[PDB]
Write a protein that binds this DNA or RNA. Sequence first.
RNA 1: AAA
Length: 460
Amino acid sequence: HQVKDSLEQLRCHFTWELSIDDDEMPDLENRVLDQIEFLDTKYSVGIHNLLAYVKHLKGQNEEALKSLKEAENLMQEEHDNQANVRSLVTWGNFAWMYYHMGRLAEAQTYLDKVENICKKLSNPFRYRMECPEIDCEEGWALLKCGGKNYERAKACFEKVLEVDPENPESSAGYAISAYRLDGFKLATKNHKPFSLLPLRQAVRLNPDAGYIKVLLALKLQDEGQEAEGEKYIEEALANMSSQTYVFRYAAKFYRRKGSVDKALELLKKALQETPTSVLLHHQIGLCYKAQMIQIKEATKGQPRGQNREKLDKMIRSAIFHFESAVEKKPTFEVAHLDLARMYIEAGNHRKAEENFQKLLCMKPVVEETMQDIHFHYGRFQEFQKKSDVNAIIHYLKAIKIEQASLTRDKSINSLKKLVLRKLRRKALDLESLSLLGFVYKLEGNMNEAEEYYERAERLA
RNA sequence: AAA
Ligand SMILES: [Ca+2]
Ligand SMILES: [Ca+2]
């Protein structure tokens, strides 16, 4: 069992516990291919190694080997024919691949190659290469393989920065990881911009990287500094680096600014290059949603004639793009939620119900998203289905998720409004009395709460 | 990637 024990010491995709879920594999493969073609980075060894690992997980070991060979071929130029320690990731994946294929002599050859380099570099381990380049590669792999891996990704880059605080690559990976983790908490009460200073530093250390500039722009916009952020959007759009990714995030920036036509123009160009992107399809749907809202405002909710035909175009186009996003990534929870909400606007309550039911069964990485699922389903039940029983059930389920948030507060307020309504139709409804006490209790009005709980108990 |  020497071979397997040695393989487990290698630092490569097979030992990084990426935990790629089958339902997310088609989208991951599409995003890996997109990144190969359109992300401008100094080294591309990592992304080709991840494609090889994906092919392996798909049962295509011969195709996986082709991607490992391409990773080696490309490095001959990304370093000018010179030796680079990132090759050890490729060699580790070769050893594992050959082990799985039964080519065990070749597997041992690649173990020996890794060991030889670990010796040459005075590495303490025989097969586990300790160097910042591989810490970065581990981090980038984690950062590509879904939100559940982002704390681990951030820690990879942080490990490098604790010894080399001006390292450009780990500064970038740390900042992007931190930005996405900030995004998970963006609706929680008292959330803070932990990623802003990291993004400033990453832009300083990677002055040509448009990808990072547009994230800095968006975080500045989050923090009420839209004008400063827009300067970074313009700088990123003036350069060709990773242009198609720059378009995605610039479009988000302009949509949130209110320039929805400009956002759509950018997204339509980006979709020509990466038509499978679920982020693009979701962003396009959000643009059509925003334009739907604009039409409702200008017509005070009663569009007619051409305005109605435009509204219907917006609704049906948003549905098309949200459906496209969830076909490609069925675990994309918030796209299902936008989709359910847009079927309400189309008047199709059965399809809205259908998507809400799917959502109630999901297990989002971001647990607070279930607050929004219950809240919007509760509103659907109250207003479209005219079911106070089910509205109360789901407002309460949102409230039971204790994390303080915008939506938890809205769920408390919606429950309060519903109950106050029922009590006007029936002042001695026991259930509504105690629920109103519950609401006051959550608000901190303990005297008003107890009098309503007591009042309810007397009737009983 | 909604918020
Ligand atoms: Ca390019
Ligand atoms: Ca190729």
